Amino acid sequence: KVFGRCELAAAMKRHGLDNYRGYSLGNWVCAAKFESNFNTQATNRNTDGSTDYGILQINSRWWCNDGRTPGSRNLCNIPCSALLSSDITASVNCAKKIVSDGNGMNAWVAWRNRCKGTDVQAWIRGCRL
């Protein structure tokens, strides 16, 4: 599923991401935009053999099992394919654990490089929230 901007904002808010660990809703929408272009089916291979999955490009090296990242962890206790569903529950719940990890949203390279220190509120401008 390719979410609309305000559509994903609403879904993320409903799932309790707005101000989760102090990060406003705009930060999450901005991250999702630059990680996946709001596309739940997005996948990208990393140099180390791991893969990033879903709207927030969650990585198999630590967070999910994809059956082809040997010697990795499955900290969210899910198959990586769960992160590709039209239903974003699995992605959001795993993102909550990631952002609690100690590095906050810096865990997302696209957020640090493209969202951090910018007017992230603009990402939820106009939405009926």
UniProtKB/Swiss-Prot annotation:
Its EC number is 3.2.1.17. Substrate binds at residue 101. It catalyses: Hydrolysis of (1->4)-beta-linkages between N-acetylmuramic acid and N-acetyl-D-glucosamine residues in a peptidoglycan and between N-acetyl-D-glucosamine residues in chitodextrins. Disulfide bonds join 6-127, 30-115, 64-80, 76-94. GO terms for cellular component: cytoplasm; endoplasmic reticulum; extracellular space. One of its GO terms (biological process) is defense response to Gram-negative bacterium. SMART domains: LYZ1 (SM00263). The active site is at residues 35, 52. Keywords: Allergen, Antimicrobial, Bacteriolytic enzyme, Disulfide bond, Glycosidase, Hydrolase, Secreted, Signal. It is an enzyme of class 3 (hydrolase). One of its GO terms (molecular function) is beta-N-acetylglucosaminidase activity. It is found in: Secreted. Transmembrane segments: none annotated. In the egg white and polymorphonuclear leukocytes. Residues 1-129 form the C-type lysozyme domain. It holds the Pfam family Lys. Belongs to the glycosyl hydrolase 22 family. Lysozymes have primarily a bacteriolytic function; those in tissues and body fluids are associated with the monocyte-macrophage system and enhance the activity of immunoagents. Has bacteriolytic activity against M.luteus. Lysozyme C is capable of both hydrolysis and transglycosylation; it also shows a slight esterase activity. It acts rapidly on both peptide-substituted and unsubstituted peptidoglycan, and slowly on chitin oligosaccharides. Monomer. This is Lysozyme C. It comes from Gallus gallus.
